[PDB]
């Protein structure tokens, strides 16, 4: 649903 930058690292 979401691009990689939508997830914190």
């Amino acid at each position, epitope marked *: 649903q979401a*691009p990689p930058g939508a997830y914190p690292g």
Partner: antibody
Amino acid sequence: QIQLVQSGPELKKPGESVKISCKASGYTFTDYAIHWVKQAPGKGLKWMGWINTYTGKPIYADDFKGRFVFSLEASASTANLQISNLKNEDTATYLCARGTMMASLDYWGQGVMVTVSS
Amino acid sequence: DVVMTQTPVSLSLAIGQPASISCKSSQSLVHSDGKTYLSWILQRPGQSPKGLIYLVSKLDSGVPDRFSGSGSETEFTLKISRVEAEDLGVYYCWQATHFPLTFGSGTKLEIKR
């Protein structure tokens, strides 16, 4: 047609709580992320985070951890924003937007203008 | 946070003239998956934004082909081949390669008549 229609109160006192609704129609609600975006009257756009519409899992930008709760009413195709303990700085338009994996924010709600005033 | 800087802050162009807006990122928007998550939106007077472009150069459904995007790592451009009266408003680039998602400072397009 694809639309996001928002609603909520436009005036609250400092300390109070507000609920802002984002109703999706014309598409599969659970196939697309909802992103929450703060727009200061005058200024640009600040990402608050997003909610997975399939799992219900919210992810918060650091500046929006604590007083900000993203939730679903999945059977009403609605995403909800709760802001609690309202402060002077929360006066803004709150926007919801439909998001894809390829990072389109294609369709946006009309926003809700919340004024925090005594 | 990735800082997205846009120039010019504003421009005034006649109908039929070409438009070029620049967007600079404070770090490479090329992700380890090989994709570049730079996008553009437009917000016209008093209204909610609309998506225009994603993955640097891909037009959102229904967006006129007068619009195009180009760029590389930290430099991106939105181009209008031929400006029309309804293209007016504030163009924002925005990125989703790095957490959190961030929006540019915005460029306001005025129509000269």
